[PDB]
Design a protein that fits this description.
Layout (H helix, E strand, L loop, with lengths): L8 H6 L14 H13 L6 H13 L9 H17 L6 H13 L9 H7 L2 H5 L4 H15 L11 H17 L2 H17 L7 H16 L7 H24 L16 H23 L4 H18 L4
Helix pairs in contact: 2-4, 2-5, 4-5, 4-11, 5-9, 8-9, 9-11, 10-11, 10-13, 11-13, 13-14
Bound molecules: ligand IFV, magnesium ion (MG) and zinc ion.
C-alpha cells in the first residue's frame, strides 16, 4: 500500500528520457516496469501481488531468441512510458493502464520468425490467423495469461471498463504488424495536414495509438549509437536464421534475411531509416510535439549509418 518502488539515482534520472537503455541486469527489468506503472498510472492501478505474478508469467512466455525476447518487451514498454509521461493530459485513466501492458505483452511467445516464414512453412498459426499471424497469437497469449488464477490485474474494473481496456490492448498489439504501419501513417499524415484530425474521434485515437505502438516497437533506432549498433547485430541474427530456414524450404530469402549480404547492412539500415523510421517519428512529432527527441535521435543514428558507408567507422 505505502510501498513505493525506487531506483538508484542514475536510473531514476535516466528512465525519464526517451533514449534510456534498461541495462544488462535481467533481474531489475520487472522492478523497472513496476516503477514505470506506479509513476504513469498511480500506485493503485493494480494489486501489487497480481501485477508481479502477471509480469513473471509474461516473462516466462517470452523465448530466448536474439531480438524478440523479454528485453525487447521492457524496452518497448519504457518507450511508451516516456511518450505517456511527456503527453500527460492527452490520455484516459484506462489508456495509461492498458498501453504499458500492451507494450509488455506485444511479442509474447515470438519464435523469432516473420509472419512471412509462418505462411511459407505452413505453421498451424498461419491456418488459424491469415493476416497479422504472430500479432493475433500475441494478443491471444495475453488473454491466456490474464485468465490464469491470481493474474487478473484488471479485476477492479467494471465489466465495461474491462472490455474497453482489452480492446485498446488488442488494437495496440495488432498495430505492431509493420505491414499495417504504412497505411496507418499515410492516413494520419493526410488527416493532420487537412486539419480533420480529431482526438475525440475514437477511430482517430485508434490510429494515433497505433503509431505510438510502431514508434515504441522501433525505439532501437532512437538509442545512443553503441546501443543502436549492438541491437542491429541481434536483429540480423534473427533475420539471417530465418533466411537460412527459407533456403531449407527451397526459397531465396529477401536480401534483408540473406546472411551472404552482410556487406550491404549499412545501406539496408539507410533504406529502413528513410522508408520506415524517419517517416514514423516525423508523423508522430507533428501529432505529439513533445516526442521530438525520438525524431532527433533517429536522425542522429541515420547520420551514424551514413558515416559507416563512407569508411569513417
Ligand atoms: C530494410 N532492410 N534491408 C536490409 N538488408 C539488405 C541487405 C543487407 C541488409 N536491412 C534492412 C533493415 C533491417 C532492419 N530491420 C529492422 C526492424 C526493427 C528495427 Cl528497430 C531496426 N531494423 N533494421
Ligand atoms: Mg511483433
Ligand atoms: Zn516488437
Amino acid at each position: 500500500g505505502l510501498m513505493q518502488f525506487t531506483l538508484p539515482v542514475r536510473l531514476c534520472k535516466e528512465i525519464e528520457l526517451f533514449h534510456f537503455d534498461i541495462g544488462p541486469f535481467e533481474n531489475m527489468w520487472p522492478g523497472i516496469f513496476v516503477y514505470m506503472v506506479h509513476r504513469s498510472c498511480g500506485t493503485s492501478c493494480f494489486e501489487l501481488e497480481k501485477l508481479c505474478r502477471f509480469i513473471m508469467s509474461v516473462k516466462k512466455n517470452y523465448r530466448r531468441v536474439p531480438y524478440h525476447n523479454w528485453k525487447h518487451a521492457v524496452t518497448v514498454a519504457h518507450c511508451m512510458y516516456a511518450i505517456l509521461q511527456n503527453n500527460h493530459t492527452l490520455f484516459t485513466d484506462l489508456e495509461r493502464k492498458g498501453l504499458l501492458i500492451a507494450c509488455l505483452c506485444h511479442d509474447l511467445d515470438h519464435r523469432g520468425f516473420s509472419n512471412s516464414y509462418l505462411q511459407k512453412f505452413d505453421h498451424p498459426l498461419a491456418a488459424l490467423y491469415s493476416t497479422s499471424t504472430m500479432e493475433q497469437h500475441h494478443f491471444s497469449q495475453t488473454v491466456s495469461i490474464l485468465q490464469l488464477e491470481g493474474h487478473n490485474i484488471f479485476s477492479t474494473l467494471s465489466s465495461s471498463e474491462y472490455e474497453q481496456v482489452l480492446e485498446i490492448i488488442r488494437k495496440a498489439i495488432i498495430a505492431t504488424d509493420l505491414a499495417l504501419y504504412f497505411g496507418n501513417r499515410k492516413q494520419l499524415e493526410e488527416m493532420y495536414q487537412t486539419g480533420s484530425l480529431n482526438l475525440n474521434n475514437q477511430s482517430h485515437r485508434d490510429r494515433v495509438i497505433g503509431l505510438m505502438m510502431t514508434a515504441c516497437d522501433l525505439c532501437s533506432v532512437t538509442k545512443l549509437w553503441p546501443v543502436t549498433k549492438l541491437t542491429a547485430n541481434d536483429i540480423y541474427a534473427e533475420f539471417w536464421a530465418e533466411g537460412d530456414e527459407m533456403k531449407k524450404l527451397g526459397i531465396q530469402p529477401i536480401p534483408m534475411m540473406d546472411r551472404d549480404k552482410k556487406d550491404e547492412v549499412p545501406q539496408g539500415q539507410l533504406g529502413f531509416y528513410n522508408a520506415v523510421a524517419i517517416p514514423c517519428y516525423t508523423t508522430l512529432t507533428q501529432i505529439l510535439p513533445p516526442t521530438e527527441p525520438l525524431l532527433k535521435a533517429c536522425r542522429d543514428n541515420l547520420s551514424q549509418w551514413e558515416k559507416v558507408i563512407r569508411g569513417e567507422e
